[PDB]
Every structure is written in structure tokens, then in C-alpha cells.
Nucleic acid binder design. Structure first.
Lengths: 104, 202, 97, 152, 80, 127, 105, 60
RNA sequence: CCAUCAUUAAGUUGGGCACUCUAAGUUGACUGCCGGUGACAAACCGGAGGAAGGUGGGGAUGACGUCAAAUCAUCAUGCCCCUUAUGAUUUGGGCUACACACGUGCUACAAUGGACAAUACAAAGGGCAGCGAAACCGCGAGGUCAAGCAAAUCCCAUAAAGUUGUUCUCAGUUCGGAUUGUAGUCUGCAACUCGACUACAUGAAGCUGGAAUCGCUAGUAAUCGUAGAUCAGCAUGCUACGG
RNA sequence: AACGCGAAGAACCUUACCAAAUCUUGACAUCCUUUGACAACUCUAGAGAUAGAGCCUUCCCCUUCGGGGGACAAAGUGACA
């Protein structure tokens, strides 16, 4: 979709939302790509065969639409898993004393 | 300082065991049957000049050896109380076969007796420093080498506790050769508990 | 035949191994003598204080001394030591046949 | 026992390649976190570039480079209170050997390249040519201990 | 908490089957900390005892992903 | 001819033998450079028979047991040193004065309780 | 210059928590001109006799202890600060003998 | 306080998850050894007194 | 535990090789022995003699005493207090809360590294329905039975760092992985308060840290992984272990 | 010389804390009296202990009569716990 060039494709598809080290296996399954594909890859006939396998995935941005509403559903029921989002609470039953900083 | 008890250095080094059995499987439960009959022997005898006991277990014929500074009182009148003991000791466990008793000379050089008989000189509340000096002067008179004993808390009847020890003779607590024997009694005087330690040697 | 000799003390398991190697050679035996198995110790590390203190503790250990006795000439005179129970104090004998 | 007397100093084992004690002492100081092999391999690939950028064998070049590192005066602080408390003191031969090895490695770790393949060998040829960063702090000690010369 | 037997309190399922037949009553005093929410629980109102005071709550249809104890608060936080 | 010596260092026993031939070691029935990791300490491992100069004389073929690679090495140079004194018994002073024939002098130190690990006391804040 | 206060069987108020820092705090702030330390105040009631106050301030070299066995927990600190101010002057004049005229050879 | 909890233990609970252990003479539950069933206080006591079988002191 | 015999799948099997090794019962290191200039006064200093050398290394052991030091919550008892309770009995909370503040550790902020492939070498300890192999079936956490066994043999268990090769190229990038939704794996009446991992996602602070401050004198600092006690399940802690 | 310390294992239990539901010879121990001699097991009602019924009315010896010793505790208090 908006991937960068001049790097290897096993790390290049990671740059979008929704892919981490599945391009090593799952995108490598459907497409006949290799590991050493730089910017000089000629991935335009290979752009189509990755477009068929990425169309099944929720990855490119649209997963964050469903991820946002899952929190919005969770706070609307007002669950203890959901109040901890709206209140800076670590949510997954953690100790909210001194070393609980990344939620503030 | 924090003097540890002198037996604990020497158990197996220069001494032996007060229980000499073995059980690989079910080590736990039949270890509890020991201190069942270490409480129970100390219940109805009730200072029958008993120093310490030994337990040995072999093929459901479990032995008990008691020392009894006053011998015959546990035996009774020609095997009376020794048979009256196995009428209850063989019921608290299964067998308790071959209950017996041996005798010891020098009735108050074993430290279990030396601590106990002057701890019982404290319920009558009479002259604790002489109660000390009665034990020291008699010790090497009877054949000991080194004697050491103290009394710790509510000393004399006052409020502030004070230790009070009296000593002479070679008492090598740090030498691993030495056959040091200590004891601790629980003399109550109806204003707390007095604690009394002793240390004999040879 | 592998008569298992294991015990807590080392002076007792050695003198009870001398019993079974003596009361078998008097009979018609060909005793492979006592070879010492390695001791299966176990360390228990309690802490010394009544209430509070770590950083000052007493370690405790208990050691079993394992040996085995095997004979390969079974006569009814050799098993007289097997049926004959001796030194039952602090040694168990796991008699296998 | 540093107040009963002096500690008995111990022997080291010289290198097999260069047949030099000084190489093995350089191995032990670049040995970060006990890793002997992963640091010795780097030194064995940090004198080939020395022997590539100069025709001489590096065992000559090593003891030539450290002589522009090893200083001859340093500062030991004497507690005189209100005085300067900085006495210029010459260097014992054991500390003379060690402190040159220290500066050679501690400024090899602060260069532009990341690999000590060539972090180390660049500073050696700088010290072989009397320049760089590990040479210029010897002159900084020779502008500090040689400025307060009133305590010879 | 395996696939095998998604857990129900089962001393509460017996008390809710009498409720869903005819017109429902709007209170079940219970504890319900152990049980999950599956679609045989919708509509009904439970007074979940949070340790201090049993709090009423009625079951919606988006509640099926979660379990019954996750709703009544026990912290009493608000504070600062 | 099999001059069989032993040798220990750092919780790793190493028994050797001496068959005549030339210098070639067969530690655990394989090559040394494929078994010992980086070939530096092998020329320090050849130090004991260096002073008796029996380079092209003896194949050894060690069976080693336990420890690590610097525990398996520095125990076969002590291994053949007990075997070199039954090859050249008058050359004992050549090995006594220089290294190999001393001992297994030292192993790891006991972890004391009330402490982090092996005499390194833990950090406390208030001095 | 914090005050880890804690009372053995006494409930601490907030009128004490301002009376401490004026006397125990401020009169030793101008001493120790590079300060970073923690104080410790014990208040131990004894129903038989009285209370007692223990103030310990550790520093780089020499600590600072003092005790009063009074029952007034406002008048006793008037004597703790007296014993504290005496002990700092012992510490400083120990190390303010740097001024010794020593001319080198 | 203490012997109520001793009486709670020795009865058979409803659940195998409760499975609760204490000592036979030590009231505390919190330092048990499931080969000895002793608290760390009295196991230190009756091994110094030798009432337990063969257990060395220390210093391996 | 297999040099010499081989039918090495290694059964380390046949014999026993018992030799070495290992595993356990005992002989030996003390200024015994010399020389100093060193004068006798013991030591010290330097040798040789054994494997070991100067209380060999380490552990255990902590004098008289100090601190009304710490526990009437391991216990035990003087005094005081309580007795439809300050004792009981249950499932449900809480001990896990948080704008914060100091202790103690873990993992890091990398190309003396990171990711993937190969390939080695340990010690200690555990296994009373417990350890559970080799096979399978799962991406994996793991499920199904038998193989062995109450154990120098059977299992936990292929230690890891290393070494060898291919890689990224010096950026908050293939550095790490905190935090949130998807697997419902397993233990257990039951994981919402309040567990343990792995699975694809998401990827935050963080570029080696100021004043200050702590540990450590050789197999020690440093690092790497393995065990055990607790325990149905659960450690970045503790205690032991080697590299 | 407190602060990965009592905690060498807080989901329940632990647990000592709190809110509820109900107990007073008390879930425990001891004299004990009639030893009433197992309500030693299932359904129902229940946060749940508990409550109500269905019930294995006994257990061993040794007399000759049906007692005493171990017999379960339904009730009891001088007591006590």
C-alpha cells in the first residue's frame, strides 16, 4: 500500500499497520518473492500477487478501525476491563503502584 | 553473643542419635509417632529422674530406651510400672514391643538431671545463688571436670531480668572433641518463667 | 541378587556390610563384595531467626550411604544369612532374589 | 594485603601468533564481559588492516604506536589541604605498560565506524603516526602535569 | 477455562430457567462471580454482591463475550 | 607402547595415553580444531612436551570428560604431563620448573548464603 | 531532608508535621552546605513511664543521634534540636582544621 | 485463633483445591516441609536435639 | 567406567576388560626439613623436597559484653482484658487500590551486537500415581496411550554463552517488546476482580545516565544457562550449581 | 544492623482484615452423667455452612445378666474452653 523501498521485503511489509514477521512466511507463501528483494525488485507483476493475499488481511489501517471500536464497545458496557481504559490505568490486572508508568 | 547450643555441633561428630531408625517411604508420619511418645513419656513420668530417651524401629518391634536416674521407679515393684506403661504405650501406637530401661550411675552429672533438680528448687523460692552453688560444688566432687550454669529471667523476684552465671573448670565449647552436655528447663515461679541452662563436661 | 544396603550413618552401613560378607563366605558363596554407591544427600536451608531475619541462616543436610551386596552362588546355606535378620538398628535391607 | 606489604604480581601467557606478552594483555582488556574468543577474533582482524595500510608487520607497529600513548609524567594527589594537592609524579614501568593499553582501547570505542574490526586499527595507525585521539590526551596530561611543575 | 465446558455457576442456571419461561421477574440475588454470559441470560437482572452491597445490573446482548463477575466494582476508588 | 597418564583441572578429568608416531591429538575420537573452538590455546596446550621436544614422537588420542573447553584444555597438557614423566622420567625438572606438572590448583568458590553469589555481597542503600 | 516519621502506638498529627521541619529541618539546612539526606523520627509511647523521641540523621561521614525521654512531644524537640545543633559543630570543627600553615620544602 | 485453624485443617474439605497444610505441633502453616511436616523453627530445634533421625548440621 | 576382541544400530552389548576413570572406606604439611649474616629472640627473607607452603582455598564454630536491639503472630506464660463475643461458622471481597515518594532487582538502550541456519562441551539436584521417553497430532503453549522406575542405570534434560556460515549496515532502522485486541493452552469447584505461558497484531519510554553512591583482590568482579525447596497452578526472589 | 524482610508460592483456602448469612458446652480439649450409644449414607430447600426427611442402631470380649473396657455423642452442668 504505502511500503518503503531500498530495503529487504522481509522487513519492508512490516512498516505498514498490521504486519510483523508474517511477510517472512504468509506473504512468502502466496507470492513467489525472495528474501533479497531491494528497491531493484521489479515488483509490479509481483505487486498483483501480493495484492490478492493482502486483500484477505485486515492489516492496512482498517484493523485500527475495528480495534478502536472494540475499546468503545468495552467502555459502553462499563466493564472492569473497560473502565480501566477510560480511567491512566494498567488494564490487564497489574499492580498500579510505582512501576506502572506507561499508562500514566 | 549468640552461643548456639553445644549439642548441635556434635550430633554425629562426637555424639550419637536420640533416634536411630530409618524409613525412606512414609518418613513424615512415623516421625510424628516419635514426638507423640516424647510428649507422652514426659507426661506421666513427670520428672522420674528421666534424662533422655532413645527410639529405634525395626520390623514393627519398635524399641524405647529410657535412662531414669532413679531406676526401678519406672519399673515399679518387680516389673509392675514397666508393664503398666506398655498397657498404654502399645495402644497409642500399634506394637511398641520390647519396652525396656537401662540404668546410669552418677545421678546428677547428666545435664538433663542437673538442670531439672535445681529448677525444682525454684518453686519453693529459696536462695537461687546457693541453688547455683549447690550444683557447682557437687559437680567436680562427684567426678566432673567443668561446670557452668545460669538463670535468666525475673531473677530473684524483681522486674528487670538479669542473667547470672557461675563457672570453673575446663569447658571447651569450641573444641569438637568435648563431650559437652547442656539442658534447658522451664521453672515457673508464678511471676513468669525462669529459664535455666547448665553445662557439664566429663 | 543385589542386596541393597543403605543407611544414614557411615560407621553402621560399613560394619553391617562386614556382617553379610562374612556370613556368606562361610557358606558356599562367591561374593562380589560391597562397592559403594554414591551418597544421595539433600540440603535443607532454613533461616535461623525466630521472626524476621534473612541474610543469616543455617543450612541442614541429611546423607544416605548406599551400598549393594550381590551373590551368584545360591545355596540354602547362603540364604541363612538372608533369612537370618541381623543388625536391624538403622539399616534397611531391600532383599531381591 | 596492601598494608602488610605488596601483593605478589602474577605471570601471564604470551600470544601464539605474534609471540608477544603485550598482545595477550591487549586481548584481556578488550575482553568485554569475559568473552575470550569473540574479542580475540576482533584483534586478529584488527591488525590485518594495520598490515594492509602499512607494509610492516603489526608486532613492530603495535610497540611503535603505544610509545605515542604511554606518558612519562602523571598526577598523584597528596592531601596537603589548602595547597594545589597535585604532585607531578613519574610513572612506574608496570603502570607505564598498562596505562598505554588503557587509552588505546577507551578511545577506540568512540569513533564513527561501529565495527571494532576498524575502530581499533584506525586509532593504532593514528598512534603509529603520532596523532588521533589517544595520543592527544597524553599531551593533555603533558599540559597539565607539566603546567603545575612547582611540586617536583 | 478450556474449550471443554465453558463454565457456568450451575446453582444460578437452575434459578434462571424458571425466569425465562413466563414473564420475567427483575431481580435475582446471587453471587455469579464464577459464571459466564451466554444468550440464555439476556434481559434478566442480577444483584451481584460485590463484598459490600449487591449491585443490580441487567444483561445486554453485547455482554456475551464477557462473564458476569466483571461488572460490579469492588475497589470503591474514586478518591484522587 | 602406551604410556597412559591422567590429568585434572577445574572439575574436568582428562586421561591420556602415548602411542608412538608424531604429534597428533584425537580428543573424543575427532579432530582438535573441530572440537576445541578457536585454536589459540592449543599452542599453549603444546607447552608440556615442548620442553622435552617430542613433537614428532607421540600421538596421544585423549578421551576427555566433563568441564568446558578451557577445562578440557589445560587438563590434557596436565594430562600428558603425568604421562611425559613415564616417557622421559629424568626430564621431571624440565616440567616442574616450567608450568604443566603442578596440579588442579583451584576451582569455583562456594556460594555463601545471605549473599548474591560467591562472596559478592548485595548492595545496600544507607551507608 | 525528608522525614520518615512513624509512631509506636501513637497516631501522628499534622501539627507535628509542621513543627518538625521548622526546628529539626531548617536549623540544619544552613549546616551541611551540599545537602542530600534523610532523617528518621521515632515516637515510642510507654504507658508505664513516658514517651521518647529518637532523631537520627545520617550524613557522608558522621551521623547525628539524640534522644529525649520527656512526655511533651513539643518541648522535647526543643532539646533534640539542642543536641542536634551541638553535634554538627563537633563534626564541622573536626574538618575545619584544614587551615594549617604547612609550607613545603 | 490458633486451634480453630488446626481444627479446620484436619477435617476433610469440600475441595481438593483447598488442600491445606500446617505442622503437627507448630501452629504456623507457612514454612512446611512435605518430607518432615515441620515448621522451620522446631525443625531447627529438634535436629539440634537429635530427635529426628540422621541429619548432619552443616558445612558441606 | 571399555586401551586390547568385534556382529557399534553405539545394546557401550558377549566376555568381563577392572586397567585407567568414577564412586566410597584411609596415609600424608609443620616453618618437619636448609641457607641467610640475623643473632640466636622468635619470626621474617630465599631455596628445595611432595601434587600441595607458610593459619594451602573455603565452610562450620562468634569470648566478656553493647543496643530496655527484634519477635507476647512459631511457640511457651506473669499480668491485664474479652465470654450471644475481641471467640465461632460459611461464599463474597480485600491483603494485588494509586497524582505520587524512596529501597531492591530484571530487561535494555546494540553492529566485541540483532535475525536464521548448522555444530559442541557441564555440574548439582529431583522423580511415594510422581518423573513421564521414543512415536505422533498441533504454528506454538501442548493433548493421546503405552516404553521404561520407587532408581550411579529410566525420565526431567538437546544446558546456554560458545564455535561455523549466511545476513541487515552505524537511527528511536532486523536495536526492545512495555501496552492494548485476537489462541482460549494448562492447572485447578472455579482465573471477573486476581494467575501462568505462546499465537498472530500493535509497537511506547529508552542512545550508556548529573550531584552522589555501592559491590569486588582469582576461578573472585563480570556474564551465561541448569536445578531444587516451597507448590494443584505461579519467582525477574531465594538457595545451591557449573561454563 | 527495616524495606524480593516474617511471605521457601495471597484466585477459594491460607487470612489474622471487611461486608453479609447464624451459632452459644460452642468446629477444639477435659472430667463426665443416660454412656440417649454412629442421624457412619442419599434426595429436597438453599451464596453456603446449615436446616428437614430416606438411614448402614450399633460395636468388640466373657461372664451369664446383659453389665463393664474401646463402645458414637443426643443432651448436661460443678466446670470449663
Amino acid at each position: 500500500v504505502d511500503i518503503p523501498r531500498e530495503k529487504r521485503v522481509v522487513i519492508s511489509l512490516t512498516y505498514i499497520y498490521g504486519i510483523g514477521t508474517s511477510t517472512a512466511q504468509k506473504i512468502l507463501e502466496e507470492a513467489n518473492v525472495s528474501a533479497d528483494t531491494r528497491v531493484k525488485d521489479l515488483t509490479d507483476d509481483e505487486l498483483g500477487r501480493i495484492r490478492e493475499v493482502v486483500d484477505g488481511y485486515k492489516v492496512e489501517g482498517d484493523l485500527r478501525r475495528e480495534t478502536n471500536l472494540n475499546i468503545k464497545r468495552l467502555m459502553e458496557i462499563s466493564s472492569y476491563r473497560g473502565i480501566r481504559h477510560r480511567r491512566g490505568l494498567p488494564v490487564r490486572g497489574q499492580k498500579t503502584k510505582n512501576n506502572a508508568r506507561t499508562r500514566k | 553473643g549468640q552461643k548456639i547450643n553445644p549439642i548441635g555441633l556434635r550430633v554425629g561428630i562426637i555424639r550419637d542419635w536420640e533416634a536411630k531408625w530409618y524409613a525412606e517411604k512414609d518418613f513424615a508420619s512415623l516421625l510424628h509417632e516419635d514426638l507423640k511418645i516424647r510428649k507422652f513419656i514426659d507426661n506421666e513420668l513427670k520428672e522420674a529422674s528421666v534424662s533422655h530417651v532413645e527410639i529405634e524401629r525395626a520390623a514393627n518391634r519398635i524399641n524405647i530406651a529410657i535412662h531414669t536416674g532413679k531406676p526401678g521407679m519406672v519399673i515399679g515393684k518387680g516389673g509392675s510400672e514397666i508393664e503398666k506403661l506398655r498397657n498404654k504405650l502399645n495402644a497409642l501406637t500399634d506394637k511398641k514391643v520390647h519396652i525396656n530401661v537401662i540404668e546410669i550411675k552418677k545421678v546428677d552429672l547428666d545435664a538433663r538431671l542437673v538442670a531439672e533438680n535445681i529448677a525444682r528448687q525454684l518453686e519453693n523460692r529459696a536462695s537461687f545463688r546457693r541453688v547455683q552453688k549447690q550444683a557447682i560444688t557437687r559437680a567436680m566432687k562427684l567426678g566432673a571436670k567443668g561446670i557452668k550454669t545460669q538463670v535468666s529471667g525475673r531473677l530473684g523476684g524483681a522486674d528487670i531480668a538479669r542473667a547470672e552465671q557461675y563457672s570453673e573448670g575446663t569447658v571447651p565449647l569450641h573444641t569438637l572433641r568435648a563431650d559437652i552436655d547442656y539442658a534447658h528447663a522451664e521453672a515457673d515461679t508464678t511471676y513468669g518463667k525462669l529459664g535455666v541452662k547448665v553445662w557439664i563436661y566429663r | 541378587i543385589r542386596i541393597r544396603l543403605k543407611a544414614y550413618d557411615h560407621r553402621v552401613i560399613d560394619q553391617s556390610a562386614e556382617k553379610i560378607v562374612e556370613t556368606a563366605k562361610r557358606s558356599g558363596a562367591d561374593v562380589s563384595g560391597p562397592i559403594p554407591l554414591p551418597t544421595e544427600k539433600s540440603v535443607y536451608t532454613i533461616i535461623r531467626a525466630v521472626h524476621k531475619y534473612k541474610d543469616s541462616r543455617e543450612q541442614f543436610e541429611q546423607r544416605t550411604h548406599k551400598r549393594l551386596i550381590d551373590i551368584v552362588n545360591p545355596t540354602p546355606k547362603t540364604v541363612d544369612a538372608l533369612m537370618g535378620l541381623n543388625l536391624p538398628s538403622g539399616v534397611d535391607i531391600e532383599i531381591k532374589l | 594485603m596492601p598494608r602488610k606489604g605488596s601483593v605478589p604480581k602474577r605471570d601471564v601467557l604470551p600470544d601464539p601468533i605474534h609471540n608477544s606478552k603485550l598482545v595477550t594483555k591487549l586481548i584481556n582488556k578488550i575482553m568485554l564481559d569475559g568473552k575470550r574468543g569473540t574479542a580475540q577474533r576482533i584483534l586478529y582482524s584488527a591488525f590485518d588492516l594495520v598490515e594492509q595500510r602499512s607494509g610492516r608487520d603489526a608486532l613492530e607497529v603495535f610497540e611503535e604506536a603505544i610509545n605515542n600513548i604511554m606518558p612519562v609524567l602523571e598526577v598523584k594527589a597528596r592531601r596537603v589541604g589548602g595547597s594545589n594537592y597535585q604532585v607531578p609524579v613519574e610513572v612506574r614501568p608496570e603502570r607505564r605498560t598498562t596505562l598505554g593499553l588503557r587509552w588505546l582501547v577507551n578511545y577506540a570505542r568512540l569513533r564513527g565506524e561501529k565495527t571494532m574490526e576498524d575502530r581499533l586499527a584506525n586509532e593504532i595507525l593514528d598512534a603509529a603516526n603520532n596523532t588521533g585521539g589517544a595520543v592527544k590526551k597524553r599531551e593533555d596530561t603533558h599540559k597539565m602535569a607539566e603546567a603545575n611543575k612547582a611540586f617536583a | 477455562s478450556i474449550k471443554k465446558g465453558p463454565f457456568v455457576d450451575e446453582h444460578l442456571m437452575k434459578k434462571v430457567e424458571a425466569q425465562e419461561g413466563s414473564e420475567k421477574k427483575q431481580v435475582i440475588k446471587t453471587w455469579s462471580r464464577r459464571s459466564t454470559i451466554f444468550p440464555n441470560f439476556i434481559g434478566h437482572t442480577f444483584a451481584v454482591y460485590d463484598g459490600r452491597k449487591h449491585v443490580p445490573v441487567y444483561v445486554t446482548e453485547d455482554m456475551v463475550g464477557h462473564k458476569l463477575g466483571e461488572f460490579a466494582p469492588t475497589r470503591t476508588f474514586k478518591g484522587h | 607402547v602406551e604410556y597412559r597418564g591422567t590429568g585434572r583441572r577445574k572439575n574436568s578429568v582428562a586421561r591420556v595415553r602415548l602411542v608412538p608416531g608424531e604429534g597428533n591429538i584425537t580428543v573424543n575420537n575427532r579432530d582438535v580444531r573441530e572440537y576445541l573452538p578457536f585454536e589459540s590455546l592449543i599452542l599453549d596446550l603444546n607447552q608440556p612436551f615442548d620442553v622435552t621436544e617430542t613433537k614428532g614422537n607421540y600421538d596421544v588420542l585423549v578421551n576427555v570428560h566433563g568441564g568446558g573447553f578451557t577445562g578440557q584444555a589445560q587438563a590434557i597438557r596436565h594430562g600428558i604431563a603425568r604421562a611425559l614423566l613415564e616417557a622421559d622420567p629424568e626430564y621431571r625438572g624440565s616440567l616442574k620448573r616450567a608450568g604443566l606438572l603442578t596440579r588442579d590448583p583451584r576451582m569455583k568458590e562456594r556460594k555463601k548464603p545471605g549473599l548474591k553469589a560467591a562472596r559478592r555481597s548485595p548492595q545496600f542503600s544507607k551507608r | 531532608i525528608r522525614f520518615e516519621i512513624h509512631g509506636d502506638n501513637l497516631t501522628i498529627t499534622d501539627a507535628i508535621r509542621n513543627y518538625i521541619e521548622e526546628k529539626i529541618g531548617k536549623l540544619e539546612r544552613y549546616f551541611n552546605d551540599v545537602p542530600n539526606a534523610v532523617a528518621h523520627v521515632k515516637v515510642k509511647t510507654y504507658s508505664n513511664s513516658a514517651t521518647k523521641i529518637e532523631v537520627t540523621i545520617p550524613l557522608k561521614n558522621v551521623t547525628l543521634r539524640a534522644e529525649e525521654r520527656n512526655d511533651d512531644l513539643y518541648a522535647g524537640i526543643d532539646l533534640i534540636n539542642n543536641k542536634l545543633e551541638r553535634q554538627v559543630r563537633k563534626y564541622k570543627t573536626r574538618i575545619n582544621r584544614k587551615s594549617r600553615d604547612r609550607g613545603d620544602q | 485463633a490458633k486451634t480453630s485453624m488446626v481444627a479446620k485443617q484436619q477435617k476433610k474439605q469440600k475441595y481438593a483445591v483447598r488442600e491445606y497444610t500446617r505442622c503437627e505441633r507448630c501452629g504456623r502453616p507457612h514454612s512446611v516441609y512435605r518430607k518432615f511436616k515441620l515448621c522451620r523453627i522446631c525443625f531447627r530445634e529438634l535436629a539440634y536435639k537429635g530427635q529426628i533421625p540422621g541429619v548432619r548440621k552443616a558445612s558441606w
